[model samples]
Target: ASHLVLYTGAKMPILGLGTWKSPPGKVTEAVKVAIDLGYRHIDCAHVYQNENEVGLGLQEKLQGQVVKREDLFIVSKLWCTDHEKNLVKGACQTTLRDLKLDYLDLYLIHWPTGFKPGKDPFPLDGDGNVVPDESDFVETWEAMEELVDEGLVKAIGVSNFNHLQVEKILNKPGLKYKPAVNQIEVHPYLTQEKLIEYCKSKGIVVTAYSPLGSPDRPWAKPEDPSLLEDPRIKAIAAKYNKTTAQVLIRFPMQRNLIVIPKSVTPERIAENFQVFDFELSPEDMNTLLSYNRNWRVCALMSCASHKDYPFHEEY
Candidate 1:
């Protein structure tokens, strides 16, 4: 139930349920269970392809009087395909319609790289390469401001943007609003201290996606390292009599960053929420922070050649 205040004076719950790859058939029930378990923040995206189902769950809870619209902090994103300034409102409206809501608590530009605008999420060229569009993210960000002015969303932010990309928005010629959050892959393996501190200095809240290293991510090779099964993490969990999942989820929370751990299972959903009781010691926190090997679960390698590929920078 702990909360953090956005620069826009919005109350963003410290913990949220991530719906990155939650299957359509399963997420609706998961959403209901999450809401029933007292989860108020949910991280979603248009690219995730399950907003409609996620909305179904939220609608049932809202219509049934379990929680008021204002009692929840709902988040969604503007897909790369809709990065053009003109298409921004239409994209947001589409999300509103699918979500069965009049407004969103927060919305984000899903990624810094823009894809060709069309029905296909990832339009490919003749060579089967991702079709990158020239729609600048700064241009996209300016359009996001319209959502706030039109009361379509309470706050706006960005995801997958490195610190430099974030600064590009902050230093925009006529910047009216600052990005409230930067959602990024951040666990012990990719601790991201520099980027987190950058966001802190700019008064932007850093949100950790894949806080448990996302073992269920769509693409996994046979031998990919699993954060949940890491012996070091297990040792730390044993020390606190907590599960590895709990320790991983708590790492960012202690650093005062928002964490979204994904799960569709009822018991796992409930277990992930149990981190508020015990705090990792200062030494433990430091040790976990020291484990940063710069590994990432959601690296957008396919877009490496895109002009705005954020991962190219040193940060």
Candidate 2:
């Protein structure tokens, strides 16, 4: 009842457990609690560097007969440094190795911009500028298609790709499989109407990451408004007897999009998945839409100058 079928005919759970920023030590229990609470989807990435502990948590569930691997929808992504075609498969294999899984249900291009191939996830020169790799993402897509051919991943998609970047792959010569999804920042503040419509028209689903304004960043300024603490949102939550996080998480679900809000707290992990019980009415949903101010907490400012940097253009 809470799943969306991808164009590939695979069912993607509408609400998933987001693992971004989930600390290694805490992530283990988070995954366990989430699974116990009936979470079937777990969003993960190599750049997050916590997949090993996430695997440990998952193992406990599997070993105890709590769930089967096929019953779980595990998702991971390829980091920018490995965007080169030759590095795609190895990166996927490494993620699989860490997760102790034979295959991923979904794999994505973490971001469009390619970084220099190496050990450092964020490579910096002595001057501290990000060292960029100019390889074409279209070429990288072609390599990812090969992974699907070899049965390493059930589906391949992109993350943080703007509409133009999505078009680049569609227009690439001899395009094999079009992207099944575009995972992007989607909160009330970042409505993303144009991009979401474009993806839907082409049979691609837009996975809403950071559905709640990310207040977890250590560097966030005090002046920034917290979405979870907004008086308006809190008022609305009180009307439904839900928490602000639940409302923010449900906002996208009502729009027929997949939403993943990251949390490691056992209570919040269970709280987040409790969204299926009540939904926002049209009056409330439109009010939430009116909250859009074009803000993005995940804006990739460091690589804004990279060749394929996505946000430079309007959707």
Candidate 3:
């Protein structure tokens, strides 16, 4: 498998298994099947609410000697509610305990917005709006730097952050470590070429989540376009002798971005990891790029009004 060398020199697998929206009951076995099929990277988040089950699978593999700790790249994120500097370490500790790991390969700020620090993942007001916290992400970033100092996490990053938000962190005066990555939704429909280029120039690796267009996203509408069924993608898949899913999976990799396609089914889990054997041509890559409509799948609309919301800018 190919690996992206982080700013800190740590190697992250270019392809990984995403755990978002994966049911708890099936994710454990999915992890096992993925690892057995040569997946060395697993993307996770506290908001996913299935770390305990994912830990079970990792434990099974570890106890059975299927793969060693260093052989895997495990990533998890701190929810928006835990953005307080004082709450950051606790959140990391919670995920570590739940994941049954001594340290995470990568830990990220789930979003640019900060919520009232507490147990509630979404501390909302009576009107169903997210209650905003006064803490700036700059302060939250200071605490994340502490995690690296204390060896609790190997690297730190941000998710769902736009170009402006990333600049704030990058330009912080006391910044000790530059963010290693910026995780966001990316696919043919939402190519985000400019944002990816900016991140690359800053030496920040970009990881594409919802690469298969997140058909299983809870907020998905009946009228939503499906990349899996798109005739354009299907035609490219046919020419390459691969499935549309494979084409979708290879699209981001061809651009040198890390991709994590999620699936709980054993067959699909194994299938998603099979992209390394083939390569997409420059012509095909441009054809896919031409389909970009600046579309986004995981728009956190509920927090659209929040002051720190990151998606409003033109990335």
Candidate 4:
């Protein structure tokens, strides 16, 4: 029910587990539990700082023979600090070591903007600003293409990229490979219809992060709106005898967009996975679409000044 074919001829599960902000000790069990409950895709990144534990969960499942190595889909991201052409390979290698896997199914640039190269994921200035690196992401893309040839990763893609930024890579001279997916924030509040349509036109699959509206996001403020509690959404959920969370998860799949909703709670993890059995009607889909307010939950405002910041454009 969750599988979809990528342009690269690989099958990616439409429903996956997102690991952002998942605490270290809890994430290991979360991954194990999710996999045990029929989850095949696990989305991760170096910036999450929990890959080591995530690896342990994967190792346990594989060693116990609960699932074969090829049966699971593991994904990791190249952090913003590793955008230099020379740093790309080493960064992926480091992630490979942490994940205890010889190769990654998919590796994505965490963001379009580059940060100062070092162990620090967020290298900040004395004034508390993100220090920018002058290296071009196009060069980074060239380095990423090498990963596919070297067999370090089966596919490569980008995250949080705007339309213009994606075009730059698409138009790159002698481009060896195209980005297979674009991971971005999408929910009922920020449907991102135009961006999804644009990516579809370019043969790129779109993956929705923060699909549950990221209620647990660290930076969330008290005044921030909640998609899960919306009465309109609640009514729709009631119509289908589903939870609002299930409604949110199902909305993206109906649009043919891959959705990853993060959670470490055992019950909630299983609850979120029960989205495939139901379908929202066309009227219900439109009712949810009307809730779009162009709201962004994961806006990286700290990097707003970076020259390569992708969200500044209309996308």
Q: State which candidate has the highest lDDT.
A: 4
- 8, model 3: CA deviation in Å? 0.6
The TM-score obtained by model 3 is 0.98
Clashing pairs in 4: none
Per-candidate Cα lDDT values, in order, are 0.92, 0.92, 0.92, 0.93
Clashes of each: 0, 0, 0, 0
Summarize candidate 4's per-residue lDDT along 1-315 as a digit string, tens digits. 578788999999898999999999999999999999999999999999999999999999999999998988899999999999999999999899999999999999999999999888899999788999979999999999999999999999999999999999999999999999999998988889999999999999999999888989888889989888889899999889899999999999999999999999999999998988889999999999888888898878889999998887888
Name the 10 consecutive residues with the lowest summed lDDT in model 1.
Answer: 125-134
Winner of 2 and 4 under lDDT: 4
Off by over 4 Å in 3: none
Cα lDDT of model 1 overall?
0.92
Q: What would the per-residue lDDT of candidate 2 be over residues 1-315, giving only the tens digit for each residue? A: 499999999999998999988999999999999999999999999999999999999989999999999989999999999999999999999999999899999999999999988999989778776788868999999999999999999999999999989998999999999899999999989999999999999999889998888898756899997998899999999999999999999999999899888999998988898889997989999999999898888877888877788888897
Clashing pairs in 2: none
Q: Report the C-alpha lDDT of model 3 over 1-315, residue by residue, as the tens digit.
A: 498999999999999999988899999999999999999999999889999999999999999999999999999999988898888999999999999999999999999999887778888899899899989999999999999999999999999899999999989997899899999899999999999999999999999988989899888899999999999889989999889999899989989999999999998987897788998989999999999888888777889999988778898
Candidate 1 — which pairs collide?
none
Clashing pairs in model 3?
none
The TM-scores of all predictions, comma-separated, are 0.98, 0.98, 0.98, 0.98
